[PDB]
Design a protein around this motif. Structure first.
Motif, short mmCIF file in Angstrom:
data_model
loop_
_atom_site.label_atom_id
_atom_site.label_comp_id
_atom_site.label_asym_id
_atom_site.label_seq_id
_atom_site.Cartn_x
_atom_site.Cartn_y
_atom_site.Cartn_z
N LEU A 81 0.79 -1.19 -0.01
CA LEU A 81 0.04 -0.08 0.10
C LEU A 81 0.85 1.05 -0.08
O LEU A 81 0.57 2.29 -0.68
CB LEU A 81 -1.16 -0.19 1.24
N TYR A 82 1.85 1.37 0.58
CA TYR A 82 2.87 2.40 0.92
C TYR A 82 3.43 2.54 -0.40
O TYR A 82 3.44 3.68 -0.89
CB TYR A 82 4.01 2.50 1.93
N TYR A 83 4.07 1.54 -1.00
CA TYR A 83 4.86 1.98 -2.30
C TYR A 83 3.68 2.06 -3.32
O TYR A 83 4.12 2.81 -4.64
CB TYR A 83 5.79 0.68 -2.66
N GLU A 84 2.72 1.42 -3.44
CA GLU A 84 1.50 1.68 -4.49
C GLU A 84 1.29 3.39 -4.45
O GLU A 84 0.91 3.69 -5.64
CB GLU A 84 0.55 0.80 -4.07
N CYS A 85 1.26 3.96 -3.50
CA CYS A 85 0.88 5.48 -3.44
C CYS A 85 1.97 6.01 -4.27
O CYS A 85 1.78 6.76 -5.06
CB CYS A 85 0.93 6.11 -1.98
N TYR A 86 3.41 5.78 -4.05
CA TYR A 86 4.57 6.14 -4.65
C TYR A 86 4.61 5.80 -6.29
O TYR A 86 5.43 6.17 -7.00
CB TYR A 86 5.88 6.15 -3.84
N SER A 87 3.98 4.72 -6.47
CA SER A 87 3.84 4.08 -7.99
C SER A 87 3.23 5.30 -8.94
O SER A 87 3.23 5.24 -9.99
CB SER A 87 3.43 2.65 -8.16
N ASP A 88 2.28 5.75 -8.24
CA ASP A 88 1.21 6.73 -8.96
C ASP A 88 1.87 8.21 -9.11
O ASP A 88 2.39 8.80 -8.23
CB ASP A 88 -0.30 6.86 -8.09
N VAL A 89 1.20 8.94 -10.02
CA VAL A 89 1.76 10.44 -10.37
C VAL A 89 1.41 11.35 -9.13
O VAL A 89 2.37 12.19 -9.28
CB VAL A 89 1.28 10.72 -11.85
N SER A 90 0.52 11.26 -8.67
CA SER A 90 -0.04 12.23 -7.90
C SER A 90 0.91 12.66 -6.86
O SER A 90 0.94 14.07 -6.65
CB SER A 90 -1.53 11.99 -7.30
N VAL A 91 1.26 11.62 -6.27
CA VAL A 91 2.28 12.21 -5.10
C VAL A 91 3.50 12.96 -5.56
O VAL A 91 4.04 13.75 -4.78
CB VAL A 91 2.62 11.20 -4.03
N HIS A 92 4.14 12.59 -6.81
CA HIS A 92 5.39 12.90 -7.24
C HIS A 92 4.90 14.22 -7.95
O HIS A 92 5.69 15.29 -7.71
CB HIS A 92 5.87 12.03 -8.32
N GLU A 93 3.81 14.62 -8.37
CA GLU A 93 3.35 15.90 -8.75
C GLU A 93 3.48 16.91 -7.68
O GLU A 93 3.81 18.03 -7.69
CB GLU A 93 2.09 15.90 -9.41
N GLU A 94 2.89 16.40 -6.54
CA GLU A 94 2.65 17.13 -5.33
C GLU A 94 4.09 17.74 -4.69
O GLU A 94 4.31 18.74 -4.60
CB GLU A 94 1.98 16.54 -4.17
N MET A 95 4.88 16.61 -4.71
CA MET A 95 6.22 16.99 -4.30
C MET A 95 7.13 17.90 -5.06
O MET A 95 7.79 18.84 -4.56
CB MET A 95 6.86 15.71 -4.04
N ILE A 96 7.13 17.54 -6.37
CA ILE A 96 7.74 18.38 -7.42
C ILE A 96 7.22 19.79 -7.64
O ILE A 96 7.78 20.61 -7.89
CB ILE A 96 8.13 17.51 -8.58
#
Ligand SMILES: Nc1ncnc2c1ncn2[C@@H]1O[C@H](C[C@@H](N)CC[C@H](N)C(=O)O)[C@@H](O)[C@H]1O
Ligand SMILES: Nc1ncnc2c1ncn2[C@@H]1O[C@H](C[C@@H](N)CC[C@H](N)C(=O)O)[C@@H](O)[C@H]1O
Lengths: 337, 328
Positions: free
Chosen positions: A9-24
């Motif tokens: 579940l944790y890594y599945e979040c980071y496999s998706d674009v949305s969290v990376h979009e937020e961070m960057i």
């Protein structure tokens, strides 16, 4: 609920674009890392770096652009495949090496001169990634090597949340809007919005801060023994005196991290304070069960402990003890929303 | 049923509803403009919540209002009624309207029953149940009807999110344009209905009404199980990337000119926003590009209160395609 389930579940979040979009898209965060890395150009030029949790690869690329000879970009989620393409797109695949898997089991061909990592969660320790960085430090960082950032600090301030005040006052305003008195709803609204035991992530401003912020803990990443403090709880006591009259709603917890100053001898601080530019981390709010009136020079004191939740080690728990003015000592136990 | 009611035991959803000025003013006027029909009459408020619509009915002149509410919020409604001095005329009765024991059949029913995409939550069946059981012959239903609309859209917010990766190089000196295909798969390639507010400039062709629900109509209950919807056709205004379709609704109150509560992106915003149905990836369209299709709203097989939408569509001369969505 098992580890394999929790990890997926944790890594599945980071496999998706949305969290990376937020961070960057978080320019304060991303530019602070870029400048913090550049500040340490003298120590990185011609040297090797491990990026713990490389994500899309952006910090690893910053390190190469700063003159690093080799960067190992270790990423446990499926996003490593996108990082591989980003690194190639920027002409860096010959010396930035995207490595899949957890840093705990990666095998590098050499110890490294520096580690860079953005490991911070809501309330600093939500996600519980810091253990992975400390593991990597012990196993892969050369003696005297560089950590970017090198330290974290936790801050607390009492708050009067203006947005919450508005939401609670809404019910007494219905009569003016619609001709129906709903002022009796206020107690119920207060129970729902304040009487829960969740940590609330919300952005505040200086207008919400009721006393001088205080550091209540320090994490120096180079320190042996930090790993065991994490398990037992990170935090400390605090005491402050109120600026003025306001309804006290609870406490805001935030953090900063510090990058060494390098050649400049001027360290760079990345802050998530409500007094500083907004970041995607916002602040972590701990609401009292109901508002408490306070005044100029009212003392507020307490103790805050950040722990992993028993149910889920990656879910932040906060134990709060507090005393407002002449009121009795109280306690409240929070878990991350 | 209890998990569903539990959602409404919390303040946040009632704050959202009553803070929705378009919604609450439309119900207020829809009721008050029907004073001639409500004066000296009895009303059943199906799902009274905090009790606000029941108090409007009293102001319209109703001699008596039964305010039926299944969630624990009925306790707050009783207090609101008392605070407004209406305990002699407005009676809060807890529990599901399906099993409540009303003292008498009523002259009118009022209800705000609509969910996202109109039929998410599936509360309409409860209103129709109450109508059959408790409404007098020739009785009044507020609102009386609902209409469903569709239009092709180009979602500006989505376009910005997809375009974000091509902008990183200007922000930080790192090219990430290769992330765009991955971002598109993540944001469009799923089969969830997405609730988001659009503006008028996201609308790519004249909106089409594709269903009408007259709540008094015989057998409406069985239609809901089989699916509600219909066919549509339209022509595009100009050049744009087609991202999919937006579905929204309006409801109409008897006129006391009919008052219409709209959730269209062309009208003031409401908390219902619109229900967006994304294609797997953007499709370029041009002025006069023909788009046709069929849309069906169903209860989900594994959860009757969860909206499912079956979409069939054809863009220009492309082959007909289908996509099957369920509410996020
Ligand atoms: N134990 C681990 N080993 C490898 N990667 C991890 C581990 N724990 C978390 N991660 C990854 O660490 C990243 C943490 C992010 N905060 C940073 C991503 C990226 N460095 C950036 O700054 O944009 C996510 O992509 C996680 O999947
Ligand atoms: N079968 C049912 N019987 C009674 N109440 C219901 C039923 N289904 C849903 N509800 C309630 O219906 C209300 C629906 C709301 N959309 C309207 C609340 C209120 N009338 C208002 O306009 O502010 C919620 O409070 C639900 O708990």
């Amino acid at each position: 609920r098992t580890k394999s389930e929790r990890d997926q579940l944790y890594y599945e979040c980071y496999s998706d674009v949305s969290v990376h979009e937020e961070m960057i898209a978080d320019q304060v965060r991303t530019e602070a890392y870029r400048l913090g890395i550049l500040k340490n150009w003298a120590a990185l030029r011609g040297k090797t770096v491990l990026d713990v949790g490389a994500g899309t690869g952006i910090l690893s690329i910053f390190c190469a652009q700063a003159g690093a000879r080799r960067v190992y970009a270790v990423e446990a989620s499926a996003i490593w495949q996108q990082a591989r393409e980003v690194v190639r797109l920027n002409g860096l695949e010959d010396r930035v090496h995207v490595l899949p898997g957890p840093v705990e089991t990666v095998e590098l061909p050499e110890r490294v001169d520096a580690i860079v990592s953005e490991w911070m969660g809501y309330g600093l320790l939500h996600e519980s990634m810091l253990s992975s960085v400390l593991h990597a430090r012990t196993k892969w960082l050369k003696e005297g090597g560089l950590l970017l950032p090198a330290s974290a600090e936790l801050f607390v301030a009492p708050i009067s949340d203006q947005m919450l005040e508005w939401r609670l006052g809404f019910w007494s305003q219905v009569k003016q809007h619609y001709g129906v008195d709903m002022s009796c709803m206020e107690s119920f609204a207060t129970r729902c919005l304040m009487g829960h035991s969740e940590i609330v992530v919300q952005d505040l401003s200086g207008e919400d801060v009721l006393a001088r912020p205080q550091r209540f803990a320090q994490l120096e990443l180079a320190r042996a023994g930090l790993e065991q403090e994490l398990e037992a709880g990170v935090g400390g006591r605090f005491r402050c005196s109120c600026y003025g009259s306001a309804p006290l709603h609870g406490f805001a917890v935030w953090f900063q991290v510090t990058f060494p100053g390098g050649d400049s001898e001027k360290p760079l601080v990345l802050s998530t304070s409500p007094l500083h530019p907004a970041t995607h981390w916002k602040q972590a709010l701990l609401y009292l069960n109901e508002p408490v009136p306070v005044e100029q020079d009212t003392d507020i004191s307490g103790e805050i402990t950040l722990l992993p939740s028993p149910d889920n080690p990656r879910r932040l728990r906060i134990l709060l003890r507090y005393k407002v003015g002449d009121h009795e000592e109280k306690t409240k136990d929070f878990a991350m929303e």
